[PDB]
Structure 1
Amino acid sequence: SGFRKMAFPSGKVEGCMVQVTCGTTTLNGLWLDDVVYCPRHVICTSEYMLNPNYEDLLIRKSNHNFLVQAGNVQLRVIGHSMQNCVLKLKVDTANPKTPKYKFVRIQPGQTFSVLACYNGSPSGVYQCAMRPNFTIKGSFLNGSCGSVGFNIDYDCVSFCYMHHMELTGVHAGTDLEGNFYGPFVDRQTAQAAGTDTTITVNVLAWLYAAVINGDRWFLNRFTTTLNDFNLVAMKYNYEPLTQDHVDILGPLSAQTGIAVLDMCASLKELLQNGMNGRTILGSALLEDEFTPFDVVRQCSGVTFQ
């Protein structure tokens, strides 16, 4: 028992991380087979951070302006191209530690692990959710650009995020095809993150984890309907709940014998009176960065190889 914010084991990703330097800018890249992926803003200078024209900047480069280092070894860049907001650097050596991988774009509410890196060197791993406003609440210092987010499916690494910038305390990036999450661009403009909301299906999954781990004080005998629940959620900036969400919570309902709409009635109450100084799984706030699948994984115990 117990319940922690748990990240995927990162070994498979650590072996893909490299350092990419162009000019006086150094950041991280992802080396899979014979391609290094990194944020295209590595080709920027100071003059072009406000209004860059990346096609122009790229045409003025040649392969030898790109220093790519895998630990000690240097990788020879033999070609380059741009795909949306990433740069693909073709190198002379295929990474022998290339895992089985795929590139997937995630949806708001889903969680992933981030391997934070500096100078191509892994520093820390943590779990976060993609927020409804398409940012993540990460932990990133200067030089972390190119750090990746990922999930593991059995033996397969699904890369879903590459870090590009910080915007007023939160973080924005792209999928691995270079397309931004959210309405952001990789230049200096007046862009800000929109209003965030709380991910309701994740809060319910976490309340089930609490029950599984013996925290029951917030339960009550009432039931509610999707529509009466969603009527109260909207007042509190909670995402509305769909029948799809009810179905996804099925396994957890089964294992605890508490119907989803039963548990919604407890959530309704918590929204209207607060916690009154009580805690749930060691938190005094309602936690929304665990998906139903995260809970099952952690409260039933699936592994990966």
Structure 2
Amino acid sequence: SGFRKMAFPSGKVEGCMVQVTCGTTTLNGLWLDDVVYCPRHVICTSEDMLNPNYEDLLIRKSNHNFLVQAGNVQLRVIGHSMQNCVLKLKVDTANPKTPKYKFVRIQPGQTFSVLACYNGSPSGVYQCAMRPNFTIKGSFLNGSCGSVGFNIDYDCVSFCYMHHMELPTGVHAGTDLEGNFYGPFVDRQTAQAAGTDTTITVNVLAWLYAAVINGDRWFLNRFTTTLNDFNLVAMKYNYEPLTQDHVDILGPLSAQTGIAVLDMCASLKELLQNGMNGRTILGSALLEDEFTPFDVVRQCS
């Protein structure tokens, strides 16, 4: 028993991490089958941060301009193309460690594991969640671009994130594996502020249900609430609006504990009103919002 923010075993992703170099810039690439996926701003020079013309920059590139390094072995680039904001380098060798995989674009509130990488070699793994403002609160240093986020269901790795840049507030922005950025961000060094971050309400509720399953009920009350009255209160604490979809998603956890969704919602209204009063829930002094209902039902059986 225990509730820890657990990341997925990174073995299937480590076997796909390579190093991509263009000019003086080195970042990470994802080697799947005979294609290497990496951020397109690897082809940017110092004068190209603010207003890069990626098409103009890419048409001036040949295959041998891209140096792909898998461990100590150099891969031969035989083709290259641009799909939105990711570069796709066709290489002469299929990755024999290519796992069962697919590309999935995720929604805010969804969680995933990140394999932090530098120079194509893995540094560490940690669990993340897509914030409502389409950023992630990860741990990235210079040279971590190309690090990927993923979920592993059975033995299939669902790649959902690729790191591209850090915003001035310390949060991080990236794309899916088709090159489409999460949120309104662009691979430009101009002023782009992330929206005010809010709490993933559906994740807090599932995390409160997990506390009830684990024998913690000190925060429950005998009040209920309407969906609108809860959203009127939750917005005042910068909580994400709770939708009817979120209510149906919490259905199984509600039936397991015997506590209605709007009953748990009134309990959350009181927790925001009172705080924790020196107490903890599942070991935390704050309300955790990076466990999805899917994580809770799976991890708590």
Query: TM class by shorter-chain length?
Result: over 0.9
**Deviation of 1:224 (Å):** 1.5
Structure 2: stretches of 5+ with no match in the other structure = none
Name the CA distance, whole Å, in 2 between partners of 1:242 and 1:25: 44
**Deviation of 1:51 (Å):** 1.4
Deviations along 1:184-206, one digit per CA (max 9) or x if unpaired, are 11111011111111111100000
Deviations along 1:242-277, one digit per CA (max 9) or x if unpaired, are 222111112211221111111111101011111112
Name the CA distance, whole Å, in 2 between partners of 1:221 and 1:49: 56
Name the CA distance, whole Å, in 2 between partners of 1:238 and 1:187: 30
Name the CA distance, whole Å, in 2 between partners of 1:56 and 1:203: 46
**Deviation of 1:127 (Å):** 0.8
Further displaced range: 69-78 or 271-280: 271-280
**Deviation of 1:31 (Å):** 0.5
**Deviation of 1:169 (Å):** 0.4
Name the CA distance, whole Å, in 2 between partners of 1:61 and 1:247: 51
Name the CA distance, whole Å, in 2 between partners of 1:227 and 1:61: 55
What's the counterpart of residue 23 of structure 2? Answer: 23
What's the counterpart of residue 234 of structure 1? Answer: 235
Name the % identity: 100
Deviations along 1:93-150, one digit per CA (max 9) or x if unpaired, are 0111111111110001111111110110111111111011100001000000000001
Further displaced range: 13-22 or 211-220: 211-220
**Deviation of 1:161 (Å):** 0.4
For residues 280-291 of structure 1, the aligned pairs below 5 Å read 280-291=281-292
SS in 2 for 1:189: coil
Deviations along 1:28-76, one digit per CA (max 9) or x if unpaired, are 0000010000000111111111211111111111111111011011100
Aligned length: 300
**Deviation of 1:222 (Å):** 1.6
**Deviation of 1:172 (Å):** 0.1
Further displaced range: 254-263 or 96-105: 254-263
Further displaced range: 156-165 or 209-218: 209-218
Does 1:33 pair with 2:40?
A: no
Name the CA distance, whole Å, in 2 between partners of 1:100 and 1:70: 19
Name the CA distance, whole Å, in 2 between partners of 1:115 and 1:156: 16
Deviations along 1:156-180, one digit per CA (max 9) or x if unpaired, are 1111100000002000000111011
What's the counterpart of residue 204 of structure 2? Answer: 203
What's the counterpart of residue 252 of structure 2? Answer: 251
Deviations along 1:68-95, one digit per CA (max 9) or x if unpaired, are 0110111000111111111000000011
**Deviation of 1:3 (Å):** 0.1
Structure 1: stretches of 5+ with no match in the other structure = 301-305
- Provide runs of 4+ in structure 1 moved above 3 Å: none
What is the Cα-based RMSD across aligned positions, in Å? 0.9
Further displaced range: 285-294 or 207-216: 207-216
**Deviation of 1:152 (Å):** 1.3
Name the CA distance, whole Å, in 2 between partners of 1:147 and 1:154: 22
Normalising by structure 1, what TM-score? Answer: 0.96
Name the CA distance, whole Å, in 2 between partners of 1:145 and 1:242: 34
SS in 2 for 1:284: coil
Normalising by structure 2, what TM-score? Answer: 0.98
